[PDB]
């Protein structure tokens, strides 16, 4: 059950994703295969590309989700979000919210 693909195989996993789904190259050691994804994993975002709908890297260091390459929307676990970027410790003149992992005045 390779899931979400129009085309598929044991050797390349999924390929040429179904409908509006997002194509995502997973890699383990030498092996690499396709995945026709719904909501891309940490570090990536659904991007509408020339070839096809494919999943791309969230530029921002330490980041879990983007709406674009260069603006983080959900920072990763441990870290605090501020103005696109992601921080371990909120910058001078700013104070933490452990609840929202957000950052303030």
């Amino acid at each position: 059950i390779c899931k979400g693909c129009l085309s598929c195989s044991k050797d390349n996993g999924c390929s040429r994703c179904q409908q509006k789904l997002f194509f995502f190259l997973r890699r383990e050691g030498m092996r690499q295969y396709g995945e026709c994804l719904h909501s891309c994993p940490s570090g990536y975002y659904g991007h509408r590309a020339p070839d096809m709908n494919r999943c791309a890297r969230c530029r921002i260091e330490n980041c879990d989700s983007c709406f674009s390459k260069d603006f983080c929307t959900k920072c990763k676990v441990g870290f605090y979000l501020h103005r696109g970027r992601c921080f371990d410790e909120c910058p001078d003149g700013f104070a933490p919210l452990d609840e929202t992992m957000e950052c303030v005045e």
């Binding site: 390929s15 040429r16 194509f23 190259l25 030498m30 092996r31 590309a49 096809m52 890297r57």
Partner: peptide, 19 residues
């Protein structure tokens, strides 16, 4: 060399930045 597989779709100039 160390073998690496590539998916054929991994080989697009299209991507600005890759692995």
């Amino acid at each position: 060399g160390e073998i690496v597989q590539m998916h054929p779709l991994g080989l697009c100039n299209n991507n600005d930045e890759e692995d």
